[PDB]
Design a protein around this motif. Structure first.
Motif, mmCIF file in Angstrom:
data_model
loop_
_atom_site.group_PDB
_atom_site.id
_atom_site.type_symbol
_atom_site.label_atom_id
_atom_site.label_comp_id
_atom_site.label_asym_id
_atom_site.label_seq_id
_atom_site.Cartn_x
_atom_site.Cartn_y
_atom_site.Cartn_z
ATOM 1 N N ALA A 143 138.950 26.047 110.665
ATOM 2 C CA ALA A 143 140.277 26.208 110.092
ATOM 3 C C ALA A 143 140.403 27.601 109.501
ATOM 4 O O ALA A 143 139.408 28.242 109.157
ATOM 5 C CB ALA A 143 140.555 25.155 109.017
ATOM 6 N N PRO A 193 134.332 15.049 103.282
ATOM 7 C CA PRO A 193 133.720 16.134 104.057
ATOM 8 C C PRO A 193 133.003 17.154 103.182
ATOM 9 O O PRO A 193 133.269 17.301 101.987
ATOM 10 C CB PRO A 193 134.912 16.771 104.786
ATOM 11 N N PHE A 203 134.996 20.702 111.918
ATOM 12 C CA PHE A 203 136.349 21.234 112.005
ATOM 13 C C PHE A 203 136.385 22.672 111.516
ATOM 14 O O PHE A 203 135.922 22.970 110.410
ATOM 15 C CB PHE A 203 137.330 20.385 111.186
ATOM 16 N N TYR A 244 133.919 22.928 108.309
ATOM 17 C CA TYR A 244 133.665 21.756 107.484
ATOM 18 C C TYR A 244 133.015 20.659 108.317
ATOM 19 O O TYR A 244 133.281 20.520 109.517
ATOM 20 C CB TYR A 244 134.956 21.220 106.857
ATOM 21 N N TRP A 269 135.900 18.911 97.744
ATOM 22 C CA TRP A 269 136.799 17.859 98.189
ATOM 23 C C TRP A 269 136.805 16.704 97.198
ATOM 24 O O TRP A 269 135.816 16.452 96.504
ATOM 25 C CB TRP A 269 136.390 17.327 99.569
ATOM 26 N N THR A 301 131.888 21.329 102.749
ATOM 27 C CA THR A 301 132.384 22.675 103.015
ATOM 28 C C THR A 301 131.225 23.478 103.594
ATOM 29 O O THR A 301 130.301 23.861 102.869
ATOM 30 C CB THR A 301 132.928 23.330 101.747
ATOM 31 N N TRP A 345 141.383 31.883 102.992
ATOM 32 C CA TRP A 345 141.610 30.486 102.651
ATOM 33 C C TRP A 345 140.361 29.681 102.972
ATOM 34 O O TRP A 345 139.756 29.863 104.032
ATOM 35 C CB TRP A 345 142.812 29.905 103.406
ATOM 36 N N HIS A 346 139.984 28.798 102.050
ATOM 37 C CA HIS A 346 138.900 27.854 102.276
ATOM 38 C C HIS A 346 138.869 26.863 101.123
ATOM 39 O O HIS A 346 139.275 27.186 100.003
ATOM 40 C CB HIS A 346 137.547 28.563 102.405
ATOM 41 N N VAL A 347 138.386 25.659 101.411
ATOM 42 C CA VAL A 347 138.276 24.591 100.423
ATOM 43 C C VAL A 347 136.832 24.541 99.945
ATOM 44 O O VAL A 347 135.918 24.278 100.735
ATOM 45 C CB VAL A 347 138.714 23.240 101.009
ATOM 46 N N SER A 375 136.818 29.147 108.299
ATOM 47 C CA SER A 375 136.046 28.201 107.512
ATOM 48 C C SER A 375 135.718 26.984 108.361
ATOM 49 O O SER A 375 136.524 26.556 109.192
ATOM 50 C CB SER A 375 136.809 27.774 106.250
ATOM 51 N N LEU A 415 132.312 16.562 108.644
ATOM 52 C CA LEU A 415 132.750 15.206 108.323
ATOM 53 C C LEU A 415 131.668 14.229 108.771
ATOM 54 O O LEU A 415 131.579 13.889 109.956
ATOM 55 C CB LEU A 415 134.078 14.880 109.000
#
Ligand SMILES: *[C@@H]1O[C@H](CO)[C@@H](O)[C@H](O)[C@H]1NC(C)=O
Lengths: 263, 212, 196
Positions: free
Chosen positions: B88, B43, B86, B35, A158, B45, A153-155, B33, B37
């Motif tokens: 995650a 934000p 962050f 990120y 945005w 990646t 999972w990763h974004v 992962s 901000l």
């Protein structure tokens, strides 16, 4: 490429909140869509996502008030929640998600992955399996495989975030006033006093002004209403020559108003 | 949820790293992962897959992991790298992501720029509304540590003051604002209204006065 | 000097039956008294000769074929027998002239949990001709789908490992076998017994 959020900027407590998100440069069979949120002072909270297939996953501790829906003829994904409270006043982000479940075929210590000929395998079909000890052979006893699951999972991208204030108050518009004025510079400004809630757009000459426009963060007057300022550094001799006008757009009150900063 | 440190600090050009401690069901899987901000911006990646850089990411960064703890590593710290960070990853399902508590970066060693103050009286139109609001704006200072006082005719003023908390500018310096709300019967009565700013022990002030 | 019956029977190790080892015996004196007396043998059958009347018999050339099988298959090491071993691994001709001598080797060839190191040929496209040795690992086509040398479903490795675990019953415990084939060719006799 980009995402574009949209929806209410204010919602009354206990109501349902409904937001939507559109895509540009790509659409809703190429990636998965996720929804993130941050209540300032707090960390990021995952809400849920809907993938190219069309099924949904949610945050276990928060799914009791959640729903995600989709419509890819508009290139749209809709998020919604019930029983909204003020803990939820936050920025809500529409996100490009990359996610996939994946298996691992592991044998116990005293066994290995091979074909009857002894050669290593690394599949899960055509006569290959976990075989025992010193052996090569077709009838050599097999044994139960051990399967491990890992979750990716990763974004990868945005949106720009949608600010939601949860409050039992009206969308009071701002009162906008002009702020008239060793280096050859002068200061113009626009005071945007009591209003509610954030955000506010401040352009200068409808965007013609760029370099110099220092817009400032707002305060929270003890009254409960916001107010901010936007100042511009200009050359002192262009005054009067160049009419300077600030365009302030507060959309929750449906009011955009412009003011000259008169000498 | 993931036990990050509250804050961290390094120096310009130097190395620094953040830890992210979780459990076996979420971080132990890997595929962590990170990120970035930068406030006022959506934000970035940073990392995806324990160490893989996202498209367009600079190589100043890199990920690392050991068992149930991930690490974000950077050197050659820039001013633009001041931000929150962050971690995650997924927990028990590819569609259930969890973030960490967040860690704030302090990039030590930047120029301690002194503040630049601008002060606006209440506008004539605002007075026509029988309201007064003195506007003190502050630009171009670092660090974001500042204190503001107001003086009426050289005497300190308590009532009517609301002050922001600083925020980043485009150049990674800080800016803030302060408002002194007055009744016009007060503003008309005094001869000096002074905005004084304390920044790392230095004092910079401006002063306005009513005219007709 | 004497024939190396020791080098064979008393050998510290054996070959898998699909790759049975053959030792040529020539120019020596075959003295069987060691074998007559070594009563640890489970099987001692001779074909074409009286088992007792050996030490007074000459032969032009002797062949000692040694391998390992399991108990139930010792019966197959005989002329005109059928089964996995007799058909795909080690076939004796119907006019066989020689002796079959076999003994249990459970203490040597059985690892606890199974000794999976002795092999036997499971699949073959045709039966073995007498005294032929097949050592190929050519992928056998068990199904109708052709294999083209790639293992898979209905495409199997033609060899299989013996499951020689010690606690088995005797019939499934490993047995070491030596088959002496005597050749009385139209040439000078080079192997005789201490008699004659
Ligand atoms: C094999 O060796 C054992 C012990 O060394 C002995 O008792 C036996 O006679 C030998 N037999 C042969 C055929 O060499």
């Amino acid at each position: 490429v980009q995402l574009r959020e949209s929806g209410p900027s204010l919602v009354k407590p206990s109501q349902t909140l409904s937001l939507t998100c559109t895509a540009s440069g790509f659409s809703l069979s190429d990636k998965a869509v996720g929804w993130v949120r941050q209540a300032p002072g707090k960390a990021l909270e995952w809400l849920g996502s809907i993938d190219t297939g069309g099924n949904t996953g949610y945050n276990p501790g928060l799914k009791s008030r959640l729903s995600i829906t989709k419509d890819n003829s508009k290139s749209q994904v809709s998020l919604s929640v019930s029983s909204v409270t003020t803990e939820d006043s936050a920025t809500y982000y529409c996100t490009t998600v990359h996610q996939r479940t994946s298996e691992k075929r592991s044998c116990p210590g005293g066994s290995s992955r091979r074909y009857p000929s002894g050669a290593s395998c690394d599949v899960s079909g055509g006569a290959c399996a976990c075989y025992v000890s010193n052996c090569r052979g077709v009838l050599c006893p097999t044994l139960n495989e051990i399967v491990a699951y890992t979750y990716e999972w990763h974004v990868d991208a945005w949106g720009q975030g949608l600010l939601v204030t949860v409050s039992s108050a009206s969308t009071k518009g701002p009162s906008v006033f002009p702020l008239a004025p060793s280096g050859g510079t002068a200061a113009l400004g626009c005071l945007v006093k009591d209003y509610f809630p954030e955000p506010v757009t401040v352009s200068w000459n409808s965007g013609a002004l760029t370099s110099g426009v220092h817009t400032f963060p707002a305060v929270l007057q003890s009254s409960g209403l916001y107010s901010l300022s936007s100042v511009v550094t200009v050359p002192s001799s262009s005054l009067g020559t160049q009419t300077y006008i600030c365009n302030v757009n507060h959309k929750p009150s449906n009011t955009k108003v412009d003011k000259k900063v008169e000498p | 949820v993931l036990n990050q440190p509250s804050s961290v600090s390094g120096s310009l050009g130097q190395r620094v790293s953040i830890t992210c401690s979780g459990s076996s069901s979420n971080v132990g899987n890997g595929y962590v992962s990170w990120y970035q901000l930068i406030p006022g911006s959506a934000p970035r990646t940073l990392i995806y897959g324990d160490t893989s850089r996202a498209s367009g990411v600079p190589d100043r960064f890199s990920g690392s992991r050991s068992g149930n703890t991930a690490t974000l590593t950077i050197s050659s710290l820039q001013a633009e790298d001041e931000a929150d960070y962050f971690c995650a990853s997924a927990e028990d399902s590819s569609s259930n992501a969890v973030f960490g508590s967040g860690t704030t970066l302090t990039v030590l060693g930047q120029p301690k720029a002194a503040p630049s103050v601008t002060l606006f009286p209440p506008s004539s139109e605002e007075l026509q509304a029988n309201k007064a609001t003195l506007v003190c704006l502050i630009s171009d200072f670092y660090p974001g540590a500042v204190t503001v006082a107001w003086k009426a005719d050289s005497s300190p003023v308590k009532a009517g003051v609301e002050t922001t908390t600083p925020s980043k500018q485009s150049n990674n310096k800080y800016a803030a604002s302060s408002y002194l709300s007055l009744t016009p019967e007060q503003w008309k009565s005094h001869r000096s209204y002074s905005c004084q700013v304390t920044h790392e022990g230095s004092t910079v002030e401006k002063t306005v006065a009513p005219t007709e | 000097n004497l024939c190396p019956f020791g080098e064979v029977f008393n050998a510290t190790r054996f070959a898998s039956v699909y790759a049975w080892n053959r030792k040529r015996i020539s120019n020596c004196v075959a003295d069987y008294s060691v074998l007559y007396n070594s009563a640890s043998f489970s099987t001692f059958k001779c074909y074409g000769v009286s088992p007792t009347k050996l030490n007074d018999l000459c032969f032009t050339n002797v062949y000692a074929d040694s391998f390992v099988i399991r108990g139930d298959e010792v019966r197959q090491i005989a002329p005109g027998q059928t089964g996995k071993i007799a058909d795909y691994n080690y076939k004796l001709p119907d006019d066989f002239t020689g002796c079959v001598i076999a003994w249990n080797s459970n203490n040597l060839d059985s690892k606890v949990g199974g000794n999976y190191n002795y092999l036997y040929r499971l699949f073959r496209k045709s039966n073995l001709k007498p005294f032929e040795r097949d050592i190929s690992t050519e992928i056998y086509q068990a199904g109708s789908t052709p294999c083209n040398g790639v293992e898979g479903f209905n495409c199997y490795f033609p060899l299989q490992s013996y499951g020689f675990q010690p606690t088995n019953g005797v019939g499934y415990q490993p047995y070491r076998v030596v088959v002496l084939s005597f050749e009385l060719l139209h040439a000078p006799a080079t192997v005789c017994g201490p008699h004659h």
